[PDB]
Structure formats: structure tokens, C-alpha cells
Amino acid sequence: IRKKLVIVGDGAVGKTSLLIVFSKDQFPEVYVPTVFENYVADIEVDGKQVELALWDTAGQEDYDRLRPLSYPDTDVILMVFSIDSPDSLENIPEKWTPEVKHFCPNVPIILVGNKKDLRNDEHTRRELAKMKQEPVKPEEGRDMANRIGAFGYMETSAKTKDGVREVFEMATRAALQ
Ligand SMILES: Nc1nc2c(ncn2[C@@H]2O[C@H](COP(=O)(O)OP(=O)(O)O)[C@@H](O)[C@H]2O)c(=O)[nH]1
Incomplete structure (x- = not known):
């Protein structure tokens, strides 16, 4: 029921923007903060309610240790x-x-x-x-x-939002199975 998700990749590719789009898509609406570390987001995928705990590595791309x-x-x-x-x-x-x-x-x-x-x-x-x-x-x-x-x-655009919901559904399925 709780699954930890970590987002990685080069600086400025849009990691934080993708987390923001997903988190703003939650209902009921909540204020979305500036940072994501063990940030709990609820998702419903297929049958199940799942708690996703989001971790962003933005800002750490050059802190290898x-x-x-x-x-x-x-x-x-x-x-x-x-x-x-x-x-x-x-x-x-x-x-x-x-x-x-x-x-x-x-x-x-x-x-x-x-x-x-x-x-x-x-x-x-x-x-x-x-x-x-x-x-x-x-x-x-x-x-x-x-x-x-x-x-x-x-493939996603955090700007247009296209594909973002589907990425998080796929990630939840993969985490479950
Ligand atoms: N055109 C476009 N710009 C984007 C997209 N996602 C993020 N950006 C922009 O890319 C820049 C870096 O995004 P950010 O989320 O901070 O990347 P991070 O460093 O990987 O967390 C920002 O100026 C965003 O507006 C996208 O899907 N399309």
C-alpha cells in the first residue's frame, strides 16, 4: 500500500516539473510544495489505492556520494x-x-x-x-x-501535461508487481 518512487536523471530534464504536474493532479486539491522527499501522494490505479512516496534528486546531480x-x-x-x-x-x-x-x-x-x-x-x-x-x-x-x-x-511533456498521468500509473503497476 505504500511504494517509494525515486526520480533520477540529468539536471534540467524536468524531474521536478513531472512531480509537480502529478501532485497538482491530485484530488482533492492540495498545495504542492517546492521540494519532494518522502512526499506522500495517493493514487488509484486499476483496483487499488496506493500511497506513493516521492523522492526528487534535483539539486543532487553533482553530489555523487x-x-x-x-x-x-x-x-x-x-x-x-x-x-x-x-x-x-x-x-x-x-x-x-x-x-x-x-x-x-x-x-x-x-x-x-x-x-x-x-x-x-x-x-x-x-x-x-x-x-x-x-x-x-x-x-x-x-x-x-x-x-x-x-x-x-x-514520452511526456510536463508543460502540456500529456503522458504524465500514464507514467505514474505505469510506475505504480511496476511497483506492485
Ligand atoms: N518545453 C518544456 N519545458 C520543460 C518541460 N519540463 C520541464 N521543463 C522546463 O525545464 C526546466 C527544468 O525543469 P526542472 O523541473 O526544474 O528540471 P530538474 O532539474 O530535472 O528537476 C524548467 O525551466 C522547466 O520549465 C517540458 O515537458 N517541456
Whole structure:
């Protein structure tokens, strides 16, 4: 009935924004604070009411020895990259997956490609082109989810809210089973 969820990924990919959208979607409405550490949110998925305890690693991306103190007893990981940052996707296999598999051995991972609203954004394409890069394609996220053994792959926009509810439903199912 209580499941611990930890959200990880590079700085500025939208970890906190995703927690905010989910927490503002709760009913009855509650004031959503600025930080998420053992933050209790109730969700109903399929039959069951579940308490999700949310932990955000934003602000700790460069504190390699302090960040893993939040990992014990985790039930599901949300591992996030940004579709507007191929660098953040490359850190999925190179940084986040080895870390999560060491500290959370058999814990399900949901791979989340956030900022999907920027895939066709003209400003984003122009800025990425300066570095000889382009937005992440959906096939690339799906392939990465298979490579790292993720339970599932989902694309979201915290800005438009599309896909956010579905990410948390999938994470709850994975935590339950
Ligand atoms: N266009 C767009 N911007 C986003 C999205 N999610 C977050 N952002 C923005 O990206 C920036 C970083 O978001 P934040 O939640 O603080 O990332 P965190 O460091 O991973 O916790 C903020 O300026 C947000 O407005 C999204 O889905 N689309």
C-alpha cells in the first residue's frame, strides 16, 4: 500500500516539473510544495489505492556520494532524459543505469523521455544544430529502454501535461508487481 518512487536523471530534464504536474493532479486539491522527499501522494490505479512516496534528486546531480543515500528501499525508479538533449540520453547508459542497478538491484525502471513538446520546436532544432545534434527520435528512446532493461518507455511533456498521468500509473503497476 505504500511504494517509494525515486526520480533520477540529468539536471534540467524536468524531474521536478513531472512531480509537480502529478501532485497538482491530485484530488482533492492540495498545495504542492517546492521540494519532494518522502512526499506522500495517493493514487488509484486499476483496483487499488496506493500511497506513493516521492523522492526528487534535483539539486543532487553533482553530489555523487550524497545522492545514493536516498536509494534504500526504493520500489520503482523514474529515469528521465529530455528529448531536447541527446547528451541527457547518453547519460542514461553511461551514468544513471549503472548507478541505479547498483543501489536498487532488482527495482523496476520506467524510462521517461520528457519535453516531447520540443521535438518539433524550431528554436530547439536551431540550437541543437549548432552542436551537430537534433532532438531524440521516439525509436531511440524505445531502443534505449530495451538496452537497459526498463519495464517500460514513456514520452511526456510536463508543460502540456500529456503522458504524465500514464507514467505514474505505469510506475505504480511496476511497483506492485
Ligand atoms: N518545453 C518544456 N519545458 C520543460 C518541460 N519540463 C520541464 N521543463 C522546463 O525545464 C526546466 C527544468 O525543469 P526542472 O523541473 O526544474 O528540471 P530538474 O532539474 O530535472 O528537476 C524548467 O525551466 C522547466 O520549465 C517540458 O515537458 N517541456
